[PDB]
């Protein structure tokens, strides 16, 4: 078995600002609503809170360094929202630097950057005037975007304008599993036209600005597999899908929302009231590439409890990370493939995050981390069929670049190829890292 990528694939590593910057209360940054959220108690783990986290505000110039001795030509990192607008009105230029001095060393170093501007970092004063329940959050979105696409924007070759709409609003406004923690169907799915609509608007400003760089968002997706041949069952599956990838997916490509989720949603939409005319035009905005988060595939069955979707997800017990997700390689080709089929079709596909949290250990000075080497590899050989068969996959960002602050997980779940010592803030490339560099420069495996 010997797999070799096109020759202008792109090969990366993600992060996100909240999970490792730290810095928190620096260099002029308000909290955010993770900053708020993570002090709730049993909203995360063992209570962590992104404080300090990896400490990267101190260390980036290190880390971009490391990125590029590691063999790697892309970095995808998130603007803090924060640290630029921590206030009504404000505009703050110590935190333009920070990103300007941020990009000033992947360019020294020969990266090339993608520039998320959301990752789900809200101010908390914006939170406070409703978050995104509120159209006018839209407006301060535009007040974000635009002044980033002016100070930046000849230096930025890819824009990813929202990192996965379905965790902000369904986890942050309908679960309560994410901030702000709100469980309210209703504006749940208020929220996740808002933010929907935030990439349109950053769409928009990005032709007015006559910026070249690519644009596009980034949808978490999942395979969703029925438990049984039950009817019951297979239905259930197909709320699921609806649910994480149609809701989100179809707007983007269709400027529709899922009819039959609109069906089952009923009186929690309230009549899609929140709709205004020209917002499904400004939403239906594919850009130049579908961005991509995948992890694992759910199996469910029906159920007639209390939940939205009365769905169960059945969790595999074999194969799977130290999170509990099942490890299906198969399912991320078949998902490609269906992103492919319906949405996309010809369309570059780019993935911005795909990883694995496996429990580390140091020894010897090194992380043999055999089993997070393995996931990739297995995920790449699906990447790999995709392609050679005409998929349009154009690139691959291993999600964590650094272990970091996983969201209601905290500090638990290391996600990283780069092992972080929180005690010390010491950065060690794992086994998995070195493998990544090698392949990355025979660009096969």
């Given at each position: 078995n010997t797999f070799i990528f096109p020759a202008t694939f792109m090969w990366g590593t993600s992060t996100s600002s909240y999970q490792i910057e730290?810095?928190?209360?620096?260099?002029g940054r308000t909290p955010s609503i993770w900053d708020t959220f993570?002090?709730?108690?049993?909203?995360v783990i063992g209570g962590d809170?992104?404080?300090?986290?990896?400490?990267h505000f101190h260390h980036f110039k290190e880390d971009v360094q490391l990125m590029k001795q590691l063999g790697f030509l892309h970095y995808r990192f998130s603007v803090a929202w924060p640290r630029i607008?921590?206030?009504?009105?404000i505009i703050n230029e110590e935190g333009l630097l920070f990103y300007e001095h941020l990009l000033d060393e992947i360019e020294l170093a020969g990266l090339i950057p993608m520039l998320t501007?959301?990752?789900?970092?809200?101010?908390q004063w914006i939170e406070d005037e409703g978050g995104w329940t509120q159209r006018e959050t839209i407006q301060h979105f535009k007040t974000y975007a635009s002044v980033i696409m002016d100070r930046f924007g000849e230096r930025i070759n890819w824009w990813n304008t929202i990192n996965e709409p379905y965790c902000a609003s369904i986890l942050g406004?309908?679960?309560?599993?994410?901030?702000?923690?709100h469980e309210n169907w209703r504006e749940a799915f208020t929220a996740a036209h808002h933010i929907l609509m935030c990439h349109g608007i950053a769409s928009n400003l990005h032709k007015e600005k006559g910026l070249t760089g690519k644009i596009g968002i980034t949808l978490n997706m999942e395979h969703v597999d029925a438990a049984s041949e039950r009817p019951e069952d297979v239905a259930a599956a197909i709320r699921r899908d609806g649910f994480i990838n149609r809701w989100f997916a179809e707007p983007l490509?269709?400027?529709?929302?899922?009819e039959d989720m609109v069906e089952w949603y009923g009186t929690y939409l309230?009549?899609?009231?929140?709709?205004?005319?020209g917002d499904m035009e400004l939403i239906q905005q594919p850009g130049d590439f579908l961005g991509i988060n995948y992890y694992t595939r759910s199996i469910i069955r029906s159920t007639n409890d209390a939940?939205?979707?009365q769905v169960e997800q059945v969790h595999m017990?074999?194969?799977?990370t130290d999170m509990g997700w099942e490890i299906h390689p198969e399912s991320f080709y078949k998902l490609l493939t269906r992103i492919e089929k319906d949405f996309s079709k010809g369309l570059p596909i780019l993935i911005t995050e795909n990883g694995a949290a496996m429990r580390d250990e140091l020894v010897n000075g090194q992380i043999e981390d055999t089993g997070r080497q393995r996931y990739i590899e297995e995920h790449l050989k699906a990447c790999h069929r995709f392609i050679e068969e005409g998929g349009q996959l154009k690139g691959y960002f291993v999600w964590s670049f650094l272990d970091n602050?996983?969201?209601?997980?905290?500090?638990?779940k290391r996600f990283g190829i780069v092992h972080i010592n929180?005690?010390?803030?010491e950065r060690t490339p794992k086994q998995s890292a070195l493998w990544f560099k090698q392949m990355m420069a025979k660009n096969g495996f």
């Amino acid at each position: 078995n010997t797999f070799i990528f096109p020759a202008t694939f792109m090969w990366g590593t993600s992060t996100s600002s909240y999970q490792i910057e730290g810095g928190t209360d620096e260099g002029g940054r308000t909290p955010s609503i993770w900053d708020t959220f993570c002090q709730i108690p049993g909203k995360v783990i063992g209570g962590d809170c992104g404080d300090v986290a990896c400490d990267h505000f101190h260390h980036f110039k290190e880390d971009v360094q490391l990125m590029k001795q590691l063999g790697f030509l892309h970095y995808r990192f998130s603007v803090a929202w924060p640290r630029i607008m921590p206030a009504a009105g404000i505009i703050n230029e110590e935190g333009l630097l920070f990103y300007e001095h941020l990009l000033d060393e992947i360019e020294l170093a020969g990266l090339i950057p993608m520039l998320t501007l959301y990752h789900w970092d809200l101010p908390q004063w914006i939170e406070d005037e409703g978050g995104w329940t509120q159209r006018e959050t839209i407006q301060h979105f535009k007040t974000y975007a635009s002044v980033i696409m002016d100070r930046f924007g000849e230096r930025i070759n890819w824009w990813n304008t929202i990192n996965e709409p379905y965790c902000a609003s369904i986890l942050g406004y309908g679960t309560g599993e994410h901030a702000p923690g709100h469980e309210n169907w209703r504006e749940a799915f208020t929220a996740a036209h808002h933010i929907l609509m935030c990439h349109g608007i950053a769409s928009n400003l990005h032709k007015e600005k006559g910026l070249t760089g690519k644009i596009g968002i980034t949808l978490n997706m999942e395979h969703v597999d029925a438990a049984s041949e039950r009817p019951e069952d297979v239905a259930a599956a197909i709320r699921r899908d609806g649910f994480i990838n149609r809701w989100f997916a179809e707007p983007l490509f269709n400027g529709k929302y899922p009819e039959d989720m609109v069906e089952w949603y009923g009186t929690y939409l309230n009549g899609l009231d929140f709709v205004q005319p020209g917002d499904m035009e400004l939403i239906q905005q594919p850009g130049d590439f579908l961005g991509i988060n995948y992890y694992t595939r759910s199996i469910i069955r029906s159920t007639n409890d209390a939940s939205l979707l009365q769905v169960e997800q059945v969790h595999m017990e074999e194969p799977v990370t130290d999170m509990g997700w099942e490890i299906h390689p198969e399912s991320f080709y078949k998902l490609l493939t269906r992103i492919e089929k319906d949405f996309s079709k010809g369309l570059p596909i780019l993935i911005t995050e795909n990883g694995a949290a496996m429990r580390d250990e140091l020894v010897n000075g090194q992380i043999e981390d055999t089993g997070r080497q393995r996931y990739i590899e297995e995920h790449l050989k699906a990447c790999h069929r995709f392609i050679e068969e005409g998929g349009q996959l154009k690139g691959y960002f291993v999600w964590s670049f650094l272990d970091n602050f996983e969201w209601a997980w905290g500090y638990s779940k290391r996600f990283g190829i780069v092992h972080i010592n929180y005690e010390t803030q010491e950065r060690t490339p794992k086994q998995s890292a070195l493998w990544f560099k090698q392949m990355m420069a025979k660009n096969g495996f």
